Structure formats: C-alpha cells, structure tokens
A paper describes a structure:
Complex III (CIII2), also called the cytochrome bc1 complex or ubiquinol-cytochrome c oxidoreductase, is an obligate dimer that transfers electrons from ubiquinol in the IMM (reduced by CI, CII, or alternative NADH dehydrogenases) to soluble cytochrome c in the intermembrane space (IMS). Complex IV (CIV), also called cytochrome c oxidase, transfers electrons from cyt c to molecular oxygen, reducing it to water. In the IMM, respiratory complexes can be found as separate entities or as higher-order assemblies known as supercomplexes. Here we present the cryoEM structures of CIII2 and SC III2+IV from the vascular plant Vigna radiata (mung bean) at nominal resolutions of 3.2 Å and 3.8 Å, respectively.
Nonetheless, focused refinements around CIV resulted in an improved reconstruction with a nominal resolution of 3.8 Å for CIV, which allowed for atomic model building. At this resolution, all prosthetic groups (heme a, heme a3, dinuclear copper A and copper B at the binuclear center), as well as a Mg2+ ion and a Zn2+ ion were visible and modelled into the structure. The residues that coordinate the prosthetic groups, including the covalent bond between Cε-Tyr247 and the Nε-His243 that coordinates copper B in VrCOX1, are clearly visible and hence conserved in V. radiata. Additionally, density consistent with cardiolipin, phosphatidylethanolamines and phosphatidylcholines was seen and modelled into the CIV map. Our structure shows that VrCIV is composed of 10 subunits (three conserved, mitochondrially encoded subunits and seven accessory subunits). Our structure confirms the identity of plant COX-X2 as the homolog of mammalian COX4 (ScCox5), COX-X3 of mammalian COX7c (ScCox8) and COX-X4 of mammalian COX7a (ScCox7). A significant difference is seen in VrCOX4, which is missing a ~100 amino-acid N-terminal helical domain compared to its homologs (ScCox5, BtCOX4). Sequence and structural analyses show that all protonatable residues of the D and K channels of yeast and mammals are conserved in VrCOX1. In contrast, several of the residues of the mammalian H channel are not conserved in mung bean. Additional amino-acid differences between V. radiata and B. taurus are seen at the entrance and exit of the H channel. The above suggests that, similar to yeast, the H channel is not a proton transfer pathway in plant CIV and that proton transfer in plant CIV occurs via the D and K channels.
Residue numbers in the entry:
A (entry chain f): 37 to 95
B (entry chain a): 1 to 524
C (entry chain j): 47 to 93
D (entry chain d): 1 to 76
E (entry chain e): 52 to 145
F (entry chain b): 12 to 250
G (entry chain g): 107 to 180
H (entry chain h): 14 to 62
Write the structure that this text describes.
Amino acid sequence: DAYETAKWEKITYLGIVSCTGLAIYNLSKGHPHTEEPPAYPYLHIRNKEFPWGPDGLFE
Amino acid sequence: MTNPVRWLFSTNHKDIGTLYFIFGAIAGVMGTCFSVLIRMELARPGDQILGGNHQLYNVLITAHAFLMIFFMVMPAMIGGFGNWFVPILIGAPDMAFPRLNNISFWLLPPSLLLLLSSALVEVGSGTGWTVYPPLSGITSHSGGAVDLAIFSLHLSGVSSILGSINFITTIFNMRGPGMTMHRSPLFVWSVLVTAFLLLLSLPVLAGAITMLLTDRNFNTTFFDPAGGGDPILYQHLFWFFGHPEVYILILPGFGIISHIVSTFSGKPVFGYLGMVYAMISIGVLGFLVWAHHMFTVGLDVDTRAYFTAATMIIAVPTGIKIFSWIATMWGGSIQYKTPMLFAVGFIFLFTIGGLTGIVLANSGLDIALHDTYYVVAHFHYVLSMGAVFALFAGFYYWVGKIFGRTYPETLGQIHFWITFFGVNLTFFPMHFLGLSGMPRRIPDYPDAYAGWNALSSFGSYISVVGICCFFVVVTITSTSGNNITRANIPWAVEQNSTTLEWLVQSPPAFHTFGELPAIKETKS
Amino acid sequence: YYIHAKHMYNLDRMKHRGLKMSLAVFSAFSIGVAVPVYAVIFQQKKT
Amino acid sequence: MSTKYIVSAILGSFGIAWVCDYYVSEKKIFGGSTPGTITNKEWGEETDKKFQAWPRTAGPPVVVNPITRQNFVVKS
Amino acid sequence: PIATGHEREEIQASLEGRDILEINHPEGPFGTKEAPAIVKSYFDRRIVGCPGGEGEDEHDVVWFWLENGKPHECPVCSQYFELKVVGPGGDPYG
Amino acid sequence: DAPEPWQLGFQDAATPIMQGIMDLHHDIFFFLVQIAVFVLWVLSRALWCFRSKISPIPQRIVHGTTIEILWTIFPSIILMFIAIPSFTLLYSMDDVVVDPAITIKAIGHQWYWSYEYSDYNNSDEQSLAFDSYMVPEDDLELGQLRLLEVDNRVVVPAKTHLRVLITSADVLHSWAVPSLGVKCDAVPGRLNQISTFIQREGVYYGQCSEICGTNHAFMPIVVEAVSTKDYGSWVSNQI
Amino acid sequence: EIKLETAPADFRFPTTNQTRHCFTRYIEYHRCVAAKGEGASECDKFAKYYRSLCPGEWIDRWNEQRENGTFPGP
Amino acid sequence: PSVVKEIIIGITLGLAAGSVWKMHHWNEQRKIRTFYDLLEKGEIGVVVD
Amino acid sequence: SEPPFRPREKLIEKQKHFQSVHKHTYLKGPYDKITSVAIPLALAASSLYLIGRGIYNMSHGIGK
Amino acid sequence: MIESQRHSYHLVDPSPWPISGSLGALATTVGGVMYMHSFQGGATLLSLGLIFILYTMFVWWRDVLRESTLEGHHTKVVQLGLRYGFILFIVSEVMFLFAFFWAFFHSSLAPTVEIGGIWPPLGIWVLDPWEIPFLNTLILLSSGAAVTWAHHAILAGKEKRAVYALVATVLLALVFTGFQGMEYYQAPFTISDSIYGSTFFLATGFHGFHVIIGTLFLIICGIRQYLGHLTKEHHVGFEAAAWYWHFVDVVWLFLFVSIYWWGGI
Ligand code: HEA
Ligand code: HEA
Ligand SMILES: [Cu+2]
Ligand SMILES: [Mg+2]
Ligand SMILES: [Zn+2]
C-alpha cells in the first residue's frame, strides 16, 4: 500500500538529484557561437515582413 | 428574458438540435444563392454578370463550397439529427456533457461570420475549396482573406471535435439498461462511426492549415519551394483529412435511410450485423486511402497501384449496404410517402454517383479526368444527392415529431419531384463535359462547350423553385392547424415500434423520459 | 416556464402563430439570399 | 388524388425556369455581354471549313479530328 | 469522505447493500402459462422492451408502452407482460 | 483533337497512352453499366411487386444466410476483373524502353507558358526559348477558337519520341492537353517527366487544369505534330 | 543537319523527378571541371546532358550562386 | 416473388446491356485500327496540301 | 492518514451554503453576482464593439 | 433526489459560458488577423479576446468544481464519462502532433535538391542533442516519476504527501520550461531559416505550450488537494492531470528521439 509510495518517492528524489547535477554541468559553459554561415538562398528568408519586422522574435 | 435564457443559455440537447436545424437552413439558402450566381455566370460564354473580375468568381466558388460542405450538411446531420435523436433513440436522458453541446453550436455562427468577412475583405479568397499553398501564399494573395478563411476552418474544426467527443462518450457511456451495444439502432451506430472519423481526421486538417497560416504570416518555409518543403506535403495532409471528411457527410445519411426503409417495409433491417460491420469497415478504410485525389501530381507507380486497390476495397462495403437495403424491401407492405420517395431517390442517385466514382478511382482514368467536370458530376451526385436527399427524408420523417404538426402530402410529393428533376438535369451534362475535357473552376469556356452549359443552367432554376416550395412546406407545417393523427400519418400511432423514439409523445416533454425504459432479458 | 409541460414547444398557444411563423421563415430566406448577393454587390462597389 | 396537381406543378416549374432563363441570359436583366464569336453567326461556318483544313505555322494546312469527323486526304 | 446529494445517496445505498434501480432489470423467465412474466415500475405506465427468447431464439427488439390496467403480450414472440407498481402509480408527468 | 459542340465522350487519340485510356474506360464502363442496370432492375421489381396492394403482410424475415456471402464475393470478382486491365495499363505505360529523341521543358509561369528546346545550343545560355500567350479577343482571324488560340505554338516532330519536363516558376500549374492524353502538374520545385510519342500530324489543343490566380482558363497549350523534315527546317530557322 | 538527340534514360531515376536528374548531371559536370578539366570530351557530354535537362532559370541561378560561393550541395 | 428467378433475370439483363456496349466498343476499336493501318500503308494522309 | 491542511468543516459549511439557495448554478454566492453579471457582460460588450470596428476597417481597407 | 429523478446521470442547469466562450474565440481570431496584418486595433483586440477566453474558461471550471464538490451531482456513471471524454481529447491531441511529425518527416527523409539533398541543411548549426535536450528529457522523466508518486499518495490514503509530490512536479515542470526558454534564446538559428529550423520551432513550440497547460492543470490539482477537494475513492481531476502529463512526456520522448537524435545525424 505505502511501499509503492516509498519506492516512487525514492526514485523521484534520485531523479531530481541527478537532474540538478546535470544542470550544474550544463551551466558555466560559455557557449561561444561560430561564424555566421554564408548567406545561402534558403536562410533568413522574408516572404512577408514580421509585424515587428526588422529582426525575428527572440533576438 | 426567460426566452433568451432558454435559447442562448439552455443545454437541453433537443433545443440545441432545433438551433442547429435553423442554422443549417440559413447556410443552405446562402450556399444555393452562391450556386445560382455561379450558374448565372456560366450560363453563356463571355462575361455574363460578373463583367470581369474572375477573382470574384473564384471567391464565389470557394465560398459556396465552404458554406455547403461545412455549414449545411454537418450542422444538419450531426448537430441537427444527431443532437436530437441520439439520446431519445438510444433510450437515455439528456446527452452527456451538455455544455460541450452548447459551446459547439455557438462556436459555429462566429465561424460563419469569419467566412463571409473573408469573402468580403480587400479582394477575396480565390483559392478554391481546397486551399492550396502556393496560391494561398503571401506572395500571390497578400490580402488577409486566406487568414480569415483559415481561422473559419479552425473554429468549425474545434466545434466539430467537441461534438464528436460528446457523441462518442454518450454512446459508450450514456446508454439505457440492458441495451447491449448490438441493440442500439443504426442511426446511433452511424453517428458513432462518423464521430470517430471526425475526432481522428479533423485535427490533421487543423495542423495543416495552422502550418499554412504560419507559412503565410509568420514567414516560415513549410510550403515555400526554396528550402525544402514541397507543396506535396500540404496535399498529403489536407487530403488525409479530405477523404475521411467525405465519408462523414454521408454516413448519417446511411443511418437515416436504413431507419426509413425499416419503418416503411413493415420489417426491420435485413442483415443487421452485416450493416454494422460494413459501416465500421467503411469508417476504417476511409483512412487507408487519401491520395486518390492527387494521381496527376507525380507520385511513383507503386503508390498509385496501392491507392487504386484501396479505393476498390472501400467500394465493396457500400455495395453490401445497398444490397442489404434492397433485401429489406423484399418483405412487403411498402407505402409510398415522401420519406420513402426520398430514400428511394437517395439509393438510386447514390448508386449512379458511386459507379462514376469507381470509374474515377483508377489511375490512368484519373490522369485523363483529373480536374474536369467529370469529377464535379461525380461528387455532386454523391454528396448533393445522397446527403441532401437523406436530409430531406429525415426532415419529413421527423417533422412528424419536432414541431408536432405534419406537412401537406401533395406539396411534399411536388417538392420531391421538382427537386429530383431539376437537380438530376443540372448535373449529368457535367459528366458529358468532363468527358469532352473542359477544365474545372473556369469562368469562361471555349465555344465548343457552350452547348450543354446552356442546358445545365436551365437546371438550377428548377432547383430554386424546389427550395422555395420546400420553405412554403415548412411554413405551412409550422402554421398547420391540424395536429398529428392516424389518418394523416401511421408512424407515431404505433403502440409497438422498432425504434424507441416514436412511442413517446408528439414533442418530447422536457426530459424525454419520466422513467427510463427496460429490457426483459430472459433466461433467468 | 415549461420544464414541467406536457409538450416542450406547445406551439399552439401563441398569438395566432401565423403571421409570426410566416415572418420568421421569410426573414430566414431573406438572410439566406441577401448576404450572398450583398457580397457580390459590395465587391463590384469596390475597385 | 394528386397526380394532376403534381404534373401541373412540374410543368409550371419548367415554365418559370424558362422565363427566368430568358430574362437573365437572353436579354440580361442583369448587365453583361455576349462574345463577338457567337453574334457574328458566320464564325462556326469558318470553324468547320477550317476543321477541314486547319492552318499551321510550319508546314501545309493539316486536318483536325480525323477519326471522329471522317475527313482526310487521299493518295497524295 | 465528503459527499452530499446524489453521490451521497448512491454511496449510502452501496454501503447498505441495496441497489438503487434494481427494479430496472426485470430478468424474468419467458412466457405466461400460469405465472405472468412480470416487470416493476415506479410510475403508472412505463416503457418495456422485449427481445424475446427462451435462450436460443430471439427477435431483435420491440418497444411497447406498457400500462397498468391491461397486460400486454409481445407482438412477435407472444409472451405476457404484467406490470406491478412499486411506487406511486401516477401519470409519468403528473 | 479540338473540342466539339454537343460532344459525347472523349476526344480523338494521338498517343498510345490515349488508346490505353480509351480502352480502360470502355472496359470499366461495360462492367459498370452491367452493375447499374442490374441494381436498378432489382430495386424496381422489389418496389413494384410489393406495393401495399399486393402484399399487405410484412412477411418478417431478418436473418439471411448464403446470400450475404454471395453479394460479398461476387462484387469482389467484379473488382478483380475491372482491376486486371488497369494494372496492366499502368505497368505498360510506365516503362520507357527507348531513349527520348528530344526534350521540351514547359515552364508554367503565372498566366502564360514558356518553352525551351534547349538541346541544340553549343553555349550555356539557352537558344530557342519563347512564350505562349493567349490571343486576345480582337486579335483573331475569322476561323480560330476563342481563348484557346496561342501565339507561337509548341512545335514537335511527329512519329518520334518526346520527353517534356513540366515545372513551374510562380505557383501551381498543370500542363494538360487532352487529345494527347497528357496531364501533369507543374509544382514550383519539381521537374516532372512525361514521355509521349505522337502518331500523326496536326494540331492539338488543351488548357490549364489547376487553379492559378486570376487568368486561369486563359493559359492554353497548343502542340503541333509535323513531319521531321519540316521540324528540322523550323528549328534551324528559329536558331 | 541538326542533331536530334538528347539526354538518355538513366537507370537511377525511373520516377518523375528529373529534379534529381538535373542536380546529378550538374554535379557530375562540375566534378569534371574540378578534377579533370581537360577531359573535354566526357565533360562536354555531361554539359550537353544537363543543358538538355535543367531549365534555364535553374541553371542561371545555380551558376550565379556557385560564383557567389553560396551553392548548396557539392 | 421467386428470388432466384428475379436475380437470374437481373443478371441476364445486365449481361445483355454489357454485350450491346461491348459491340459498340468493338466497332469503334475496329474503326481506329483500320484508320491507323491505312495511315501507315494506304492512300490516307493527314496534311491537306 | 492526514486530512489535508484544512479542518474540512469549512467545506461542509460551504456545502450547506450552496445547497441552501434557490438559484441557478452560476449565480450562487455573493462573489458570483459581481463576477458573472458584470465582468463577462461588459467584457463581451467591448469585445463585440471592437470586433465590429475591426471587421469594418479590414473590409474597407482603412486605418492601416 | 435520485429516487424521484429515477436515474443517476447528470442534468446540468443553463449557463452562458458556452456562448461567452464562443464570443471570446471570435474576438481572439479577428484580433489575430488584425495583428498578423498591420492594423490599428490589432494588438488590443487580440489581447482582449485571449483574456476573454481565459476568463470564460476560468468561470467554467469554477462552475464544474462548484457543482461536483459542493452540490455533489457527480455520481459513479458521470465520473466514468469524464474519463472517457478526456481520453478522447488526448487521442485528438495525439493525432494533431502526428500531423506535425508527418510534416517534419516528409520534409526530412528525402531532402530536396535545393538544400543540397542532405540533412541538416548546410550552415544550420544543429544543437548538440546531448547538452540541453538530454537535461530536458531527464527533467520530464523525473516529473513523470513524481506524478506517479503523487498518484500513489492519493490512492494510499496518505492525503498529505500528495501536495508535496504535486509541488515537486510543478517545480520540475517550471525548471523544464525555463530551460526550454534558455534554449530558444541561445538558439543558433531562428524560425525563418530553412525547413529544418521551421519544423523544429513549430513542433517544439506547440510541445512547450502543451507543457505550460499541463503544468497549470497540475497547479490547479495541487491547490485542490491542499484544500481537501480530492479523496481516495472519488478523484478525476488528478487522474486527468496524470494522464495529460504522461501524454506530454511521451510526446517529448518521440520529439527528442526523432528531431534531436536523427535530425542531427
Ligand atoms: C454540400 C455540398 C454541395 C452542394 C449541396 C452543392 C450544390 C450545388 N452545386 Fe456545388 N460544389 C460543391 C459542393 C456542393 N455543391 C463543392 C465542394 C464544390 C467544389 C468547389 C471547387 O472545386 O473549388 C462545388 C462546385 C460547384 C460548381 C463548380 C464551380 C467551378 O467549377 O467554378 C458548380 C457549377 O455550377 C456547382 C454547382 C452546384 C449546384 C447547381 C448546386 C445545386 O444542387 C444547389 C443545391 C440544391 C439543393 C437541393 C441543396 C439546398 C438545400 C437546402 C437549402 C435545404 C436544406 C434543408 C435543411 C437543412 C432543413 N458546384
Ligand atoms: C461525398 C462523399 C464521397 C463519396 C461517397 C465518394 C465516393 C467515392 N469516391 Fe469520391 N469524391 C468526393 C467525395 C466522395 N466520394 C469529393 C468531394 C470529390 C471531389 C474532391 C475534389 O474537389 O478534388 C471526389 C472525387 C473523387 C475522385 C477523384 C479526385 C480527383 O482526381 O479529382 C476519386 C478517385 O480516386 C474518388 C474516388 C471515390 C471512390 C472510389 C468512391 C467509392 O467509395 C464509391 C463507392 C460507391 C459505390 C461504388 C456504389 C455502390 C456499390 C455498388 C452498388 C456495388 C457494385 C460496385 C462495385 C462492382 C464495387 N472520388
Ligand atoms: Cu477520397
Ligand atoms: Mg490537380
Ligand atoms: Zn418478445
């Protein structure tokens, strides 16, 4: 009855501990971007300008 | 204030059915006005009433197609007859999830307003019924009309999803006592199967047109050729919706026709399990073929072969159904009232439409006949004749019940004959022109095809006369000063009825059931 | 209210019902064959 | 019983459809036009005589619809 | 737990051992020779459906609007249906 | 080859493909007229011999055996019979054993076509390219058709193989000439191949079968099949 | 005097995508021009093939892209 | 009323109609075959002059 | 076994209050008076007016 | 009372929330068009319609909770019917995301000649499928385990630890949406890029939106469980939340595998 609750409690605690460790790993990375690719025809297309036109959202 | 509460607020599946019927009638009249305008433009070669502006003609064909394929048959088969006669017939109180019922119905009219405003904005949506991507692109339209139409499709789709969830949960849960699944009538069964198709297929259309929307405005490249993303992707998605879409406009018709034949032949439906399994198989095999609408675009040979085979296999079960109906008239004691007239016309004209469909199902024949008025004749017989004639049959058969009055008989037969003659004259020359080779969706034709299009144009006005007669019938019914009797009609007077819905009252009281029915269920 | 009525509609009761239903159906037809024509009329009223 | 009424109403419906057609596409109570190719009344004439020998850009005049019209040249 | 109204009545019945609508399943042996094939009804007259059948035969379904004063026999399989009110016999809508 | 007033059925054929199409449609129509007449006959005899004045007793039969399986099986063999020829037509039309002799790109612009018989030029820039405009109403001679006559038609040698690469430049289109029995879609990204082989001289007309923008049905296609010597003279003169 | 011949029927592409046929022929011709350069015979063969196959607009756009250094694919 | 007799007569009428249509189709096929046969090996040409 | 952070008799009092009124479902309580007659009502009125103005402007091609 | 009603099903009473929600949807759609194309009333109309839909949805769920918790109209049968309806809704959402996956696959199995006939398109710096996306998968996996822990809290009669498990799950879901936001901001390619970027961003955005709605569902269930509205025998809201969250996790698993693993290969 309660053994199942204890067991899933244990594995959820394990999950959050491992996830917090992995978050510590992923952060502190500088993430330096590489050079912009050459302007291939299929990149940065503007069929109809955005309402906030000049640059896309999230930039 | 009490009446506005009872209408705008009430759940009451019967009242929602009445509202659905009124909306269906309005949408049907609008669609027929568009059809008459199309016919007026196509009456003679040259510019007839549009005086140019073929863009407006394309807008007209798009609006006619949407209006009658989304706002006339679906609000009348599912919302109209479904809402009313699923819980009454199955032997249940008010439907499950009444608020979903109300929200679906009140979602529909804003969808109608969106569609008309899409036909009314800066220039219009001249992209056809099946909005194809590159034409509906922002380079070629740049209006917003296509955006409004796409949102109209979103609202209609969401409403139909809500209705489908309603019907599925009601049939699976809200049945009466003792009533095994194999004792629910075929109307309930067809509504179940069509609700499953509406639940499964329709979200794919929502995804496809959402993708089209974000291709137009938010500047993606799903259907822009430069960057991958061919328009074939949209063809695939829209038609994976499209064919389940067309085996939904006719399944409630099948259910209603089965009921009408059963009640007029003095005997129930021959081969009940055959009917049920054939209809389930039609539902299942409505999915496994979706590209038989795009044979002439460049698929490889093996896909063409497979879709040919799939269309033939989907042809078989409809044959089982029609032969079953023919069998369940071998008994006797027929009686040729107007519902029987319309059921018989349904069977005959749907047979003609189905055979033409078979002719179209092959590959090479579709290579020769793609996008020519042969296809228009095929689906106008099938869809118009089948769905609309089943609709009229159901309407007479059950206006015996909704309002409590009864139509005059000579006017009912006059309307049947007028409509049959007109709408069967006006669509057979479409077969002949399609064989000749005229392309579909054109405002002007070469001089050679002018011979028949004068004759077909003579067919629309007869159908207009028929519809006006039908509305005279509806008004004289709603003001007929002579209620339901035995001399008038012999249905509701039955002390014993195969279907549960005839032995209740003239209209159902308010809950349709002071106390639920039972079943003896012997072998104690 | 008529939740506890023998008939959900009880259509007979209203005031002669005839003019009302006639106007109802005629206005339904008018809305069905007015807007489709009006859309074309407006489009030609435009450019 | 009513076959008189039904048949009479069908014929009346045909009459009304004819009248509406005549007013809307023969005299055009709603504005419109007619092509120059049909009002000339001699265009079909030349169209048929040209099915006999249809002009061409590179080569002598050549026939069209050879089978369904049974029109074609002989030994030469 | 917490409950009041319809769920409370349901759970009180399922705790006391009684079935609320056990009158809604007749489940009787076929026919009437000296014993009527009986149903139960909370009102004066009620809808009853016969599928018929000793256990092998059956007819699809027939709905008849059974009433109190008059026993009704199934049209096709010809068995009696005698009603016996277990509530206040009144017109279902009063 | 051209459309006819008050015509029933297909136009005339100038391609083995179109012969196959005619034969397949005729076989299908034979089987389906059999089906339709039989169904109409059985329905009529059922309605008429039991018309409430001969048989006022329902006769009450609901379960049927050894006839349901019969109308489940017999339509199956009917479908097998009407799918034997279709598959043969498909798998005998796909194969191109012979090499194509020419190559005629047909780029479907917005409301007018274009063509390039590019396989005659020593350079990279293409010679022999032109546009196929519909002739307006007042620019016609006393004979030609309406909205179906074209300036500077497609020229093709007769009795020798072809290969036309349909494609588009603006929106969806379709190259569709019925007399040759050729219909395919020009999608702005792909290059569809059609292998055809005319059998006789003369001119063949066709139209667009897809919704392009506004001048749809005013975007026609004309193909001439002429003798090989004359085709050579015309190409050498056009270069 | 005229040639009256064109690209052959390639075993690799029995479908209806001479779009792939176009791209393949273009890549083979430029692989010539890169590696051999003086295999003028075989590479004129490849050149004639893609000229016959690829539409003029595609050829011009791809040549300009190749000059600009933004030509996707090999 | 005899069910087998009705189905037999229906099949027979269907076959008769199909035979009529097939005779039509055969005559049309013969016309096409003889036209092309001559067009290769006969007086018939297609260019008028 | 522990009741969740409430005495659970406040819920019983609320049940008594709700079952002890003679109105529809959406009007029960004093909160719902304000809520379900003023907020949706004025909100729908404003929505209707803005929808009408927007359709008018889009159709006529004014006020870009 | 049931003995007079003679059947245990539910009969609701009229409420204007259907029509009000439909009017809100019309407001949202016309505002959406008027903001997609530059117009004066666009942004304000879209926002007003969106908050209208939110408000009607709020009062609707409030009404359902009011009925079923205080009036007690839910009997066993309508309790079952609610589960039926929600399973059907999940099936519909499955088909929707199937359509999106079909779009991706049809665009990525045979890449066109115009992106080099290769995948991914040259010049799109694919995310390493192991730094952030792996952490997101681990976070959602732990969230699913925590939801199961909450379910076994409710079932086992221990009605106090249920709020602890639910709050742990909400924290994990918030961490996931925060890391997805970080991924969007640090993206080395935008939506207006090739079909790769386009399908990536559309699919991932709808998945994140489903994550937001599932998270808020879980928040509602957490507040209800804290207030005591749920019991061991009679709880459907929590079961709906658990099924929806399992749906979101499964969709994320398919998404991660296909897009992040295969597309980057
Ligand atoms: C619901 C389906 C439906 C119906 C009923 C109709 C009805 C009619 N249609 Fe329509 N049509 C389509 C669906 C339908 N159509 C579709 C999908 C297309 C494709 C568009 C395109 O390709 O892009 C099309 C296209 C189409 C075209 C080609 C447009 C083009 O090529 O440019 C034409 C040409 O005349 C045409 C004509 C007609 C005519 C004369 C009728 C007449 O039959 C008018 C109908 C007559 C009736 C008898 C029905 C009215 C009934 C009532 C109003 C009563 C309702 C009762 C209640 C609900 C109680 N239709
Ligand atoms: C309204 C519903 C409906 C129905 C029921 C059908 C029925 C069928 N349709 Fe139809 N179809 C449409 C809707 C519908 N269609 C629409 C809307 C279009 C136009 C789409 C567009 O605008 O592009 C179209 C067009 C269309 C096309 C061409 C699309 C294009 O190329 O233009 C094709 C070809 O594949 C096709 C196939 C079939 C087949 C095989 C059937 C079969 O299921 C028919 C089955 C019926 C029977 C065959 C009759 C009963 C059978 C017998 C009595 C037994 C004897 C028969 C045999 C021997 C098997 N349909
Ligand atoms: Cu289909
Ligand atoms: Mg096509
Ligand atoms: Zn019995």
